[PDB]
Amino acid sequence: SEPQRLFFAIDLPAEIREQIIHWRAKHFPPEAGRPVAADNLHLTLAFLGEVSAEKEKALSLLAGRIRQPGFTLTLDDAGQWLRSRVVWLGMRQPPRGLIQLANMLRSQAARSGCFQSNRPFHPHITLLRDASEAVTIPPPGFNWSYAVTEFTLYASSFARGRTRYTPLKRWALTQ
Ligand SMILES: NC(=O)c1ccc[n+]([C@@H]2O[C@H](COP(=O)([O-])OP(=O)(O)OC[C@H]3O[C@@H](n4cnc5c(N)ncnc54)[C@H](OP(=O)(O)O)[C@@H]3O)[C@@H](O)[C@H]2O)c1
Ligand SMILES: [Cl-]
């Protein structure tokens, strides 16, 4: 049909999402920035931008040929990027498989003509947007650790008053 704004990402188990939003509400007032909805919390692997249906099929076939074992993410880091005006969660030492997976999807995107910045992959989970002022960043909560078993292609849209990330396809990682 019509083109969509697409990105590949890793999702978070519902319980960890709940812990994150509780932690965020505890540590950041509304004025700190605009909260990412619980269901929209994710770790982007590759951003594709606007993509026709034909190109989406092509990239989906490429993603489907990726053979990457699963890995575990332990979110032990938080920070703020003032240039992007985001507050994020992350991993001090991401597993090699995460980097490998993101690098493959980014290369596939770039080869298809998708704008990739030459910027190095910086894995993160955005918690607050429009965080234009420096705020104290506490460490994340305890034991936000989980096994990643798959990755997903999402469509991004703004409908009503809300950002919506819609899952289109998923691919298991080898476990
Ligand atoms: N009033 C309005 O009309 C309005 C207002 C706001 C948003 N919107 C729309 O609603 C959606 C919200 O946008 P969004 O910012 O929530 O999501 P988005 O712009 O669709 O991006 C989705 C994900 O891709 C990442 N990303 C974007 N460019 C990238 C790049 N060059 N390299 C690596 N990663 C990249 C973002 O990273 P980060 O997580 O680091 O940002 C984000 O996690 C968009 O479709 C936007 O057009 C509309
Ligand atoms: Cl959101």
Numbering used by the authors: 2 to 176
The authors write:
The 2H phosphoesterase superfamily is an ancient group of proteins and protein domains characterized by a common fold and a few conserved active site residues. E. coli LigT is a 20-kDa protein that exhibits 2′,3′-cyclic nucleotide 3′-phosphodiesterase and 2′-5′-ligase/phosphodiesterase activities, but the biological function of the enzyme is unknown. The LigT structure presents a typical 2H phosphoesterase fold, in which the catalytic residues reside at the beginning of strands β2 and β6. As in other 2H family members, the active site has 2-fold symmetry; this symmetry also includes the 4 water molecules at the bottom of the active site, connecting the active-site β strands through water-mediated hydrogen bonds.
Another product analogue of the reaction catalysed by LigT, NADP+, was also trapped in the active site, being well defined in electron density. In the NADP+ complex, there are 4 monomers in the asymmetric unit, and the nicotinamide end of the ligand binds to each of them differently, having different conformations or being disordered—depending on crystal contacts. The adenosine 2′,5′-bisphosphate moiety in each monomer binds identically, however, and in a mode highly similar to that seen in 2′-AMP. The 5′-phosphate mimics the next phosphodiester in an RNA molecule, and it can be used to deduce further binding determinants for RNA substrates. This phosphate moiety is bound by Arg6 from the N-terminal strand β1 in the crystal structure, and it is likely that this residue plays a direct role in RNA substrate binding also. An additional NADP+ fragment is seen stacked on top of Trp82 in one monomer. In the NADP+ complex, we actually observe unidentified electron density of a stacking interaction, modeled as a fragment of NADP+, on top of Trp82, which could reflect low-affinity binding of some moiety in NADP+. The orientation of the reaction products 2′-AMP and NADP+ in the active site indicates the direction, into which an RNA molecule would continue, considering the last residue sits in the active site.
